[PDB]
Amino acid sequence: ATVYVGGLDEKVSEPLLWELFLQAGPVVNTHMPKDRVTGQHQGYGFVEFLSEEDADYAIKIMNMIKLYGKPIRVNKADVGANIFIGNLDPEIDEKLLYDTFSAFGVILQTPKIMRDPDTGNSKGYAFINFASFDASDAAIEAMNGQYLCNRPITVSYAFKK
Template sequence: MATISTLFSSPNLLRRPISTPKLTLKATPFQKLTSRGSYQRLYAVAEEVAADPDSKAARRVYIGNIPRTVDNAELTKIVEEHGAVEKAEVMYDKYSGRSRRFAFVTTKTVEDANTIVDKLNGTEIEGREIKVNITEKPLLQPDLSLVQAEESQFVDSPHKVYVGNLAKGVTTETLQKLFSEKAKVLSAKVSRVPGTSKSSGFGFVSFSSEEDVDAAISSFNNTLFEGQKIRVNKA
């Protein structure tokens, strides 16, 4: 019988699922994880990279804290100064359409990925210091299922606000509690850096009516919350 290590050495790993009598793993970087399979998936990514250094996971670079004005074309131009790019994708919030200030870049080779990390991590784009690393590192975190559960519990509504410049310690619960003081809140969420529970510095609050949206903006825009002046506007 083939072992897990043998299966991960196959060059077709990224094109087909791998089956064992107990679970099925498909090597996609950010698939949804069940509580049963999360640890198997995390260790599978690590073993994939170790067994096949040229795998897509080893060539996929995370770039965080980029300005909202940077799009795919501009990011590609910046990164290609240091390595060949297969694909560059800036991530956008599905509710507001705003850039989430991070992106993923798939390079042609592992050497390109490593060079990009060495040359760009800690540098600045439009005055913002960016964070650059290979994506299997943030994947190796045990709290992904909790973050995904929080995302799935958010109740979307046409009546919602974007809340920016949140302090890093703000949670979904404290955000919802704040806005509940002035309006009837349906749901709230704090956006997270992919693969971690770290706040991205912004969130969303949904309401049942446009009157509640107006009340939230007039009550909280440019007010201090946990030491920072927050921005509140219609999403």
């Protein structure tokens, strides 16, 4: 029943946190046990919502939730660990893509489709940072060459800017 609010926005108060937990499910406790001096939330928070499937679909919905604009992570309570991906589908979404590829590692970057500014359709390319380099190994090995959404995937550890 316990959920980790990471990326908890510096000013997104327990009001916003538990008002989002209540709008999704039986919000029985949200808590930002925080820095005992600065008072600001800890960047890590513990929220209990009584139902396990409630917490599950809550974590499914609260990925990339933009508290104070920054995506707030809700889950179970930067060395270059990114995978770049070719042959991507233009029908893809970033939340759905995190839901798909995230089982090998959580989304330490939201999956950005490298798409032009002129039209707004994908070029078959993307990039997203996983948790670990071992996570990049697993993700890109179970997603390398296999059949993605529309175009069979092609993903490897990140080429950096």
